[PDB]
Structure 1
Amino acid sequence: GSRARVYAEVNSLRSREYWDYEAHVVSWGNQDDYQLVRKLGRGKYSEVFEAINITNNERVVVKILKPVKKKKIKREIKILENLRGGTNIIKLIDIVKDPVSKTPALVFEYINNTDFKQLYQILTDFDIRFYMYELLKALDYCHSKGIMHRDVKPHNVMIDHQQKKLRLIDWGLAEFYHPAQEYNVRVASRYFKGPELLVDYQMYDYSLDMWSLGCMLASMIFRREPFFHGQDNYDQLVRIAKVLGTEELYGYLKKYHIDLDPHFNDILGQHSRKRWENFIHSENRHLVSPEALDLLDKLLRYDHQQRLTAKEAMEHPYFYPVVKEQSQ
């Protein structure tokens, strides 16, 4: 069966308490330190507020977890503990609960985010390299800690374009990687789902995050956001196959012995692999380079095992201007 090319054994080489999140004992702060100011949004199992820490006047974010899916809550809490101090990972400030109802909430640092719909249309070539490099730092960190994020997408990549600060947020779908474990494919947003998820291949790994990152890179350099805009999960794979090719898809399925849902037979058609240069036009030309296209081609590949790791991506020549500037 398939295995990650990197960090495959990191969890088995650590103490069981590192990854056995169900056994984790939470340390609780003081709920009354935090005053809710404004609702930011709502997820399926949580709601997020801007708040003020009344002890230091500082703005924070409070994520109230409800439904209280107790196992999912300990998983997110333990993953955040394991990732503490990691580069560009959202900082968890506190964990509190209502003393009477016991409903728990997470408290995070506040990032003055620029909405990606507006931001992605005005980034320069250097900006794209810079922010992608910062995102890769967070992914290399979490993968090296034995954790897959599983929900990489613009909404979960918060960018303060004034201070040039990036944070990878929302670790509620993240999971520990264990070799040969079969994982639920109902993760990630439709537009960022790797082909392994779309064909119901459960033995995936950290490389799922690199497909999602490649999707973001494509949307930034080409200015089509989202880059692969399927109408549903079936159409999502069709949109991918029109670019990467159908014979190439079948070769990937054959390599990993993946069964293809027969509903695909009537919708996939026959499509050659396309050159990434086909997406260049006058409005995005200044953002595209041989280096960008080479990197993108090494990320948006069917074969999850052949995609660049986060570390390998950071070493790519596309990031040399960032590396050279982070040393001047």
Structure 2
Amino acid sequence: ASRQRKLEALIRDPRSPINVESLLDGLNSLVLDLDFPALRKNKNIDNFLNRYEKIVKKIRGLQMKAEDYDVVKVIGRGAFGEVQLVRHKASQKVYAMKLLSKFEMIKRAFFWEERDIMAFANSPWVVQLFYAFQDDRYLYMVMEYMPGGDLVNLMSNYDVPEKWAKFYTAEVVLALDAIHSMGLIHRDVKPDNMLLDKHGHLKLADFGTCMKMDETGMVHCAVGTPDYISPEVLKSQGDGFYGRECDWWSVGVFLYEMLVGDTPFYADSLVGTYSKIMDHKNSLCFPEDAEISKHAKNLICAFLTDREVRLGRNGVEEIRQHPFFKNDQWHWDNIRETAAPVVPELSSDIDSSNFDDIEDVETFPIPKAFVGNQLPFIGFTYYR
């Protein structure tokens, strides 16, 4: 009973590898991976499935499921799956729910490690995870809805003045400081990941790229669209190592797209984008027509240089000290409680005006032998 108290404690700890959610995930996966007629020929499998069939159904009904949510509309669709604006039926609260195809996911081990670190850190600069669940086909992630839309949408609807770019860059800078302080490297900082909350304040979202830094403060191994990716990250794709400074390159790309209107290494092809990024010493140029302050040009260039000499290599203090961030509207300690330059007008809690309309799927193939397709997702379920 003393050893049983110690064992009953690990299972109660929600941050434990084997806990109630993990144990339930294990039993659900075991039932799913064995419920195939070819496998059912084995008496051990058929009998286990018979005993636990009814109870696994009862348990699946009590646990959080997709049916507990009302699908308002799709606000993003991709290769992975979609993002739905949903409302929890019982609490009546609106959330953003990403659906990941388990099948597509498997074609890419413990990938939610960084999601858990970020979820626990609970930074006001990072889009919050409330719950995560799963069914045979999908992985579900219930996130805080960011009704202000992303910075792709803001950029395509506004001509961004230096007062505005000075604010979003500072918020991205504090969000990246937060992520690095968790022992993480975002890896794919771009305006699709820059989401705006109910008041127009920025938060960084991780769409599966965040990685835990090793003892040396480095990562490895994905890119997708490269406009915001540093040369070191491109060159690593390979098993190459890079640090947190790869995220500061994306801040420079961001400041450029805000003030200029186009990405600094844009091209009609992906190859050309990749090339212009690698030859960034010759290809970086500001248009004559685009009027940009000396400090703005300076800051973009301090970030868009080789990792060795890039701004942020010494720390965040030199980025904050940069004269571009001299202003009469905010401080580095109070920026999030100051007036945001673009305040959203939201008539209802399901107002999705800042999101482009989408409106309107492959699965695992039935196995002959046990293959354990559900095994990699044991522990994904998150409840707090």
Query: Do the structures match in fold with TM over 0.5?
Result: yes
Q: Is 1:50–1:60's contact at 8 Å kept on the other side of the alignment?
A: yes
Tell me the secondary structure at the aligned position of residue 30 of structure 1.
coil
Match of 1:85 in 2: 122
Aligned residue-pair number? 269
Match of 1:320 in 2: 326
The one-letter code sitting in structure 1 at the alignment partner of 2:117 is I
> Residues of 2 paired with 1:117 and 1:104: CA distance?
26
TM-score norm. by structure 1 comes to 0.71
TM superposition shift of 1:72: 5.0
TM superposition shift of 1:61: 0.6
> Residues of 1 paired with 2:111 and 2:278: CA distance?
36
Tell me the secondary structure at the aligned position of residue 126 of structure 1.
helix
CA 167–324 in structure 1, closer or farther in 2 if over 3 Å, else same: closer
Match of 1:35 in 2: 70
Q: Is 2:88–2:95's contact at 8 Å kept on the other side of the alignment?
A: yes
Pairing 1:55–2:63 present:
no
Q: Is 2:86–2:94's contact at 8 Å kept on the other side of the alignment?
A: yes
The one-letter code sitting in structure 1 at the alignment partner of 2:294 is P
TM superposition shift of 1:124: 2.3
Match of 2:39 in 1: none
Match of 2:206 in 1: 170
Pairing 1:214–2:214 present:
no
Q: Is 1:222–1:280's contact at 8 Å kept on the other side of the alignment?
A: no
What do you get for the CA RMSD once the two structures are aligned?
3.1
> Residues of 1 paired with 2:88 and 2:243: CA distance?
37
1:143-222 aligned within 5 A = 143-160=180-197, 163-178=199-214, 179=216, 183-184=220-221, 186-187=222-223, 189-200=225-236, 202-222=240-260
Match of 1:5 in 2: none
> Residues of 2 paired with 1:217 and 1:25: CA distance?
44
CA 47–222 in structure 1, closer or farther in 2 if over 3 Å, else same: same
The one-letter code sitting in structure 1 at the alignment partner of 2:140 is A
TM superposition shift of 1:35: 2.0
CA 117–193 in structure 1, closer or farther in 2 if over 3 Å, else same: closer
TM-score norm. by structure 2 comes to 0.61
> Residues of 1 paired with 2:80 and 2:316: CA distance?
29
Q: Is 2:266–2:276's contact at 8 Å kept on the other side of the alignment?
A: yes
TM superposition shift of 1:111: 0.9
TM superposition shift of 1:200: 3.0
TM superposition shift of 1:26: 8.1
Match of 1:14 in 2: none
Unaligned runs of 5+ in 1: 1-20, 246-270
> Residues of 1 paired with 2:310 and 2:151: CA distance?
29
Q: Is 1:64–1:105's contact at 8 Å kept on the other side of the alignment?
A: yes
> Residues of 1 paired with 2:127 and 2:260: CA distance?
28
CA 242–67 in structure 1, closer or farther in 2 if over 3 Å, else same: same
Tell me the secondary structure at the aligned position of residue 41 of structure 1.
strand
Match of 1:259 in 2: none
Tell me the secondary structure at the aligned position of residue 131 of structure 1.
helix
Q: Is 2:246–2:307's contact at 8 Å kept on the other side of the alignment?
A: no
> Residues of 2 paired with 1:67 and 1:22: CA distance?
23
Q: Is 1:87–1:137's contact at 8 Å kept on the other side of the alignment?
A: no
CA 22–307 in structure 1, closer or farther in 2 if over 3 Å, else same: farther
TM superposition shift of 1:46: 3.3
> Residues of 1 paired with 2:326 and 2:18: CA distance?
41
CA 58–195 in structure 1, closer or farther in 2 if over 3 Å, else same: same
> Residues of 1 paired with 2:268 and 2:191: CA distance?
18
Q: Is 2:311–2:319's contact at 8 Å kept on the other side of the alignment?
A: no
TM superposition shift of 1:159: 2.6
> Residues of 2 paired with 1:80 and 1:126: CA distance?
30
- After TM superposition, the structure 1 stretch with the greater mean CA deviation from structure 2, 41-50 or 138-147, is 41-50
Structure 1 stretches (4+) deviating beyond 6 angstroms?
A: none
The one-letter code sitting in structure 2 at the alignment partner of 1:30 is M
CA 319–182 in structure 1, closer or farther in 2 if over 3 Å, else same: closer
Specify which of 295, 302, 309 is matched with residue 291 of structure 1.
295
> Residues of 2 paired with 1:45 and 1:72: CA distance?
17
TM superposition shift of 1:112: 1.2
The one-letter code sitting in structure 2 at the alignment partner of 1:147 is L
Unaligned runs of 5+ in 2: 1-14, 23-62, 339-384
Query: What's the CA shift string for 1:156-180, capped at 9, x where partnerless?
Result: 10135x8221121134111111127
CA 23–307 in structure 1, closer or farther in 2 if over 3 Å, else same: farther
CA 318–195 in structure 1, closer or farther in 2 if over 3 Å, else same: same
Query: What's the CA shift string for 1:43-73, capped at 9, x where partnerless?
Result: 3333211100223322111112222547254
Max radius of gyration: which structure? 2
> Residues of 1 paired with 2:89 and 2:320: CA distance?
40
> Residues of 2 paired with 1:165 and 1:182: CA distance?
29
Tell me the secondary structure at the aligned position of residue 301 of structure 1.
coil
